């Protein structure tokens, strides 16, 4: 498909850090790892099914929110995940939990309504 990440001309303009990247970045990989199973991305696959799909929902998602709401967020599963990552198993099950959470998107749900479910994982 054809795709060149444009969320990134945004989130420049969210200025974020090291730590923000770092987990924005896990959590869009983790997207990419676990929206392909049907089981967990049960929208994504019937919403169309691509990668670019996914780098579509993560920007319109996070437009529709605040700078401060974006931060929020990626601090609340940057510490879950460092507290997580310890344990790869455990780990694995809370990537699987954000990814399902995340494919509600896919489904015209609202972007504060499905960042709840992200921001109130763990």
């Given at each position: 498909?054809?795709?060149?990440?444009?969320?990134?001309?945004?989130?420049?303009?969210?200025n974020?850090?090291?730590?923000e990247?770092?987990?924005?970045?896990?959590?869009?990989?983790?997207?990419?790892?676990?929206?392909?199973?049907?089981?967990?991305?049960?929208?994504?696959?019937?919403?169309?099914?691509?990668?670019?799909?996914?780098?579509?929902?993560?920007?319109?998602?996070?437009?529709?929110?605040?700078?401060?709401?974006?931060?929020?967020?990626?601090?609340?599963?940057?510490?879950?995940?460092?507290?997580?990552?310890?344990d790869?198993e455990?780990?694995?099950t809370y990537?699987?939990?954000?990814?399902?959470?995340?494919?509600?998107?896919?489904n015209?749900?609202?972007?504060?309504?499905?960042?709840?479910?992200?921001?109130?994982?763990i």
């Amino acid at each position: 498909g054809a795709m060149g990440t444009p969320l990134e001309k945004l989130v420049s303009r969210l200025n974020l850090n090291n730590t923000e990247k770092e987990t924005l970045t896990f959590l869009t990989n983790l997207l990419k790892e676990k929206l392909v199973d049907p089981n967990i991305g049960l929208h994504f696959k019937n919403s169309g099914g691509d990668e670019s799909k996914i780098e579509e929902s993560v920007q319109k998602f996070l437009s529709e929110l605040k700078e401060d709401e974006i931060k929020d967020l990626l601090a609340k599963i940057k510490e879950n995940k460092d507290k997580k990552e310890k344990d790869p198993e455990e780990l694995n099950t809370y990537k699987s939990i954000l990814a399902s959470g995340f494919d509600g998107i896919f489904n015209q749900a609202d972007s504060k309504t499905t960042l709840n479910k992200l921001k109130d994982t763990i």
